[PDB]
Amino acid sequence: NAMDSRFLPATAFIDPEGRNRNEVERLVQQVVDLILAKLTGAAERPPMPETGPITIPEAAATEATLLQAIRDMVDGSMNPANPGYIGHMDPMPATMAILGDLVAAAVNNNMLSLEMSPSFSRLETLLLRAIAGLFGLGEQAGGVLTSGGSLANLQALAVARNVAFDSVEPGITGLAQRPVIFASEAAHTSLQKAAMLLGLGTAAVIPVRATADSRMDPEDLRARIDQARGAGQHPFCVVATAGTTTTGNIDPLAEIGAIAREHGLWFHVDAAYGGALVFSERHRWRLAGIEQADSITFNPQKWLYVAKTCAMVLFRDAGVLERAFRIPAPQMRATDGFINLGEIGVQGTRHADVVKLWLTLQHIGQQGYARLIDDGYRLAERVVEGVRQRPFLRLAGEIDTNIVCFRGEPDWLPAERWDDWNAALQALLLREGKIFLSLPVYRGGRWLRAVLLNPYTTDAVIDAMFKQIDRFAGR
Amino acid sequence: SRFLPATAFIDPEGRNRNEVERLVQQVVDLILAKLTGAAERPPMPETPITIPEAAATEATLLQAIRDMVDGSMNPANPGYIGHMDPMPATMAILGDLVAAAVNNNMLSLEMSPSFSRLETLLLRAIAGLFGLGEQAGGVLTSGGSLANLQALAVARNVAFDSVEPGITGLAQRPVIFASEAAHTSLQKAAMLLGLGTAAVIPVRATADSRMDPEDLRARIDQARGAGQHPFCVVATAGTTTTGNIDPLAEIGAIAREHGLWFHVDAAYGGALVFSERHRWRLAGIEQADSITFNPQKWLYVAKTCAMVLFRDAGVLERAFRIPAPQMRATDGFINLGEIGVQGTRHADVVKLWLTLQHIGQQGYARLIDDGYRLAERVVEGVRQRPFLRLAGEIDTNIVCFRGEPDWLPAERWDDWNAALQALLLREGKIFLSLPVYRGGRWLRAVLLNPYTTDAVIDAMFKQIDRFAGR
Numbered sequence A: 001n002a003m004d005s006r007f008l009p010a011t012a013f014i015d016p017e018g019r020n021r022n023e024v025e026r027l028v029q030q031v032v033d034l035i036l037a038k039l040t041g042a043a044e045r046p047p048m049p050e051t052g053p054i055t056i057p058e059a060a061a062t063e064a065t066l067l068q069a070i071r072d073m074v075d076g077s078m079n080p081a082n083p084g085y086i087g088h089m090d091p092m093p094a095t096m097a098i099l100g101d102l103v104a105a106a107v108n109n110n111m112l113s114l115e116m117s118p119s120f121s122r123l124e125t126l127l128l129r130a131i132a133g134l135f136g137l138g139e140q141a142g143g144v145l146t147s148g149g150s151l152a153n154l155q156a157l158a159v160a161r162n163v164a165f166d167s168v169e170p171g172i173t174g175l176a177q178r179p180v181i182f183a184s185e186a187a188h189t190s191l192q193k194a195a196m197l198l199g200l201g202t203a204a205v206i207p208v209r210a211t212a213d214s215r216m217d218p219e220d221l222r223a224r225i226d227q228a229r230g231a232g233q234h235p236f237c238v239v240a241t242a243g244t245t246t247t248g249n250i251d252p253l254a255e256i257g258a259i260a261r262e263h264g265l266w267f268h269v270d271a272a273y274g275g276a277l278v279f280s281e282r283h284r285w286r287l288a289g290i291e292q293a294d295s296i297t298f299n300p301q302k303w304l305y306v307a308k309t310c311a312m313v314l315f316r317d318a319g320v321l322e323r324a325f326r327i328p329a330p331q332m333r334a335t336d337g338f339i340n341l342g343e344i345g346v347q348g349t350r351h352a353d354v355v356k357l358w359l360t361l362q363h364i365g366q367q368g369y370a371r372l373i374d375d376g377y378r379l380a381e382r383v384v385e386g387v388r389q390r391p392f393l394r395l396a397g398e399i400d401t402n403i404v405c406f407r408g409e410p411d412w413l414p415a416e417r418w419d420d421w422n423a424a425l426q427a428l429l430l431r432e433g434k435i436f437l438s439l440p441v442y443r444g445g446r447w448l449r450a451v452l453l454n455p456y457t458t459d460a461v462i463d464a465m466f467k468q469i470d471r472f473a474g475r
Numbered sequence B: 001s002r003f004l005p006a007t008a009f010i011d012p013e014g015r016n017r018n019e020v021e022r023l024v025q026q027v028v029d030l031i032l033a034k035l036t037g038a039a040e041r042p043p044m045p046e047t048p049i050t051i052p053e054a055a056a057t058e059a060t061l062l063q064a065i066r067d068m069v070d071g072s073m074n075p076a077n078p079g080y081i082g083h084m085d086p087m088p089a090t091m092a093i094l095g096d097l098v099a100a101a102v103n104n105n106m107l108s109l110e111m112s113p114s115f116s117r118l119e120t121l122l123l124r125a126i127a128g129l130f131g132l133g134e135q136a137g138g139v140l141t142s143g144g145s146l147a148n149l150q151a152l153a154v155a156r157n158v159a160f161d162s163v164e165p166g167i168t169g170l171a172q173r174p175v176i177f178a179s180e181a182a183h184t185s186l187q188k189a190a191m192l193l194g195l196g197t198a199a200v201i202p203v204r205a206t207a208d209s210r211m212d213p214e215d216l217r218a219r220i221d222q223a224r225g226a227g228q229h230p231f232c233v234v235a236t237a238g239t240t241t242t243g244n245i246d247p248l249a250e251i252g253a254i255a256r257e258h259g260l261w262f263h264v265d266a267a268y269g270g271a272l273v274f275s276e277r278h279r280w281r282l283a284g285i286e287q288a289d290s291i292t293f294n295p296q297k298w299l300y301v302a303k304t305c306a307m308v309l310f311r312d313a314g315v316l317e318r319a320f321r322i323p324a325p326q327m328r329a330t331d332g333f334i335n336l337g338e339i340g341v342q343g344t345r346h347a348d349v350v351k352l353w354l355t356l357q358h359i360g361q362q363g364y365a366r367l368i369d370d371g372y373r374l375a376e377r378v379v380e381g382v383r384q385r386p387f388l389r390l391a392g393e394i395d396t397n398i399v400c401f402r403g404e405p406d407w408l409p410a411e412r413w414d415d416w417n418a419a420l421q422a423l424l425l426r427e428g429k430i431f432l433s434l435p436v437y438r439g440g441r442w443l444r445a446v447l448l449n450p451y452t453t454d455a456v457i458d459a460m461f462k463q464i465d466r467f468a469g470r
């Protein structure tokens, strides 16, 4: 065959009868040893790297070239494994998440259908049923894994739209009244992208006023709904966010949901980040009201430390996916009751994320996550206290998760020079402190953003951060 | 109190190096054992979930991995010849190990400084291979469904200016055209885009499952007469069931003649660009407005790996990207999340780039040749047996065929072919798929496994001969 020819490297594939096993094992071990050396020594690389030409070669690259490429890829990539990386909802991966993706890629199954993923499709369906149980959604609840929270939000909104307008087969172009959804002004932009994609347009996402603590104002929500109907629009969904992207705040889920139900609006909870609190006895009360959601988005890739991507959309009634999403096609359900997951997802073919998810959940355990979450809050509160002791600094508001947004508002500077002050501080922290904070645009200004995810971030890192902030301000 | 395993994470200062090395090695040795011994497992497997409070033991995790592999489908078996799902290239497996380890995010340049630039440059080069021109480029997507979704979204946005106001105010229903043999992801995309599944108007296909240009013309005029608004034609380069290629040049010319967006779904057949001998089959694709292509299929890249390419990559900024302050880097690159359906995204470019380098264009040309050779062996085997019938001519390494025995009434043909398919798998350890096609059940051979040989094909027909009595 081709694998005996001189046009293929002897290690292009793994011979299923072991004829090239020694050569493969050697190549595999090269990469394993290299990557392990890079990860066990990750602190040697800064949180951010210090800075083609791309041509697809005719002949096979040498193993020396392949390994150099891997080396260059790692060295030029961001390093959230560095204890000083505290700026984004992007964590160092759990060991079993890395190993899970090795397993997933090796067996290379397809979530598209049962016969292409006999074990994984069943594992995923059962696992998400259990997880929906943790959210308190009831016994009809379930969902699918998606390649990212944006897709999860897209699918929920698609179901909300289909349920309200019966649009699976005729579409929505016939409507005289514009469909609109409501969300906090601090909600994620994937909502606007979803609305665009769904044929609603970006402007169909009506922003609801958030408080000083970046939580949705239920009073304004009700006002916006009335105003929308007054404008001849057709509201059909409300989105509450459980852990906003910038400040990590949690909307008042019960109040929002009650308003949604009063007006017959689909209640979607975007808990991409904050959804992890269900593993925390100490903190899951913060999610009170989420158990009544019509749909939930949750991203284990964030606070559950699962290697990207890992996200899901859960429905309180999983059958809604067959009634108001699934395209017309003959039934092909298996004898033990499972359905081809491709039929009820945005994606068709899909990578088996369930492997790394299930393996990581088992390795760490609920108690493990409860501990990690507590440490997150602990570090966040240390940042909060440090800011409060510095009058030239300002919190964005109360915190609800392990995220602290703050900025310098010094009186030796006029307000219009604050963005440059903070941008320079962020640059200084990274360059000389090897500490990475993000600098999002928030409330028309530039704010510093701390996301305390790295389990190897210590009190000393935070202290070092403030120590350098002090010098930049001349204390 | 609550316990974290010493190997839950990898200590960046090496304090748990020895323990994490041992755990990784155990999984590596287990996976390598299963793959180098994959022929020991049949193509398909033979025959409660609670999140634990406490950390699971290493023995438990390894046993779970063992159970997961043994319970999975096995395309690495030489007898797996039924789907567009191949055994992964070695560097694709290793690529995903690398990607998970560094755990970067394709959402923005800041979160994937190397990967974002590598992907953009790689897809420019690939767009060039399709002959799309100097402005061409695109993004990797998690699946060809998303690629088709994004392409059709852009087509819609360009024609109806719908990025901000949407399409609800329209009076004429927007419709697209595709072969009756085209992929169902078009219908799902149409549903998602607010067009509805019925917006995909099926165009008659020939006996060889290729879109008929004249019927395309007829359906378009008909749509306009029925007060509809055509805005896109989708040609398919490698249909899912039979693997046939639409006449891209003729379809594209008709599309451009009617001012319609021309999208080529080359999810499978796109791989032919790496074949000097066979890429002439995609003649006409170079004038497409957009192209879908899935390296996860015929380029052996572990799932997922797919892309959408645009002849003018700039159209993503004018008719897709949502309003936001621009954040362009000084070297010209843009945050990929802004111009994709997905935001956060797994770095598929790692396995794609490593696999492309390892196999090379020569390697893919060789693999593709072998596929055609095996396919032609199946076609010849069918032609020698009057009780079997070909679905039509083949264009790629895919052969769709079925038994139509005269000792059975036509209503029993489905059962005959279903029984044959089950017999082949159980007795011969040979997997063919059995899709619904033209109202019946057809056998489907997809000859992708580099370790599938003539003997496998011979054993298949011998098995077929026994079942038929011959």
Ligand code: NA
Pocket: A200, A201, A202, A203, A204, A205, B164, B165, B166
């Ligand atoms: Na709009």
Ligand code: NA
Pocket: A147, A308, A309, A351, B142, B303, B304, B346
């Ligand atoms: Na993926």
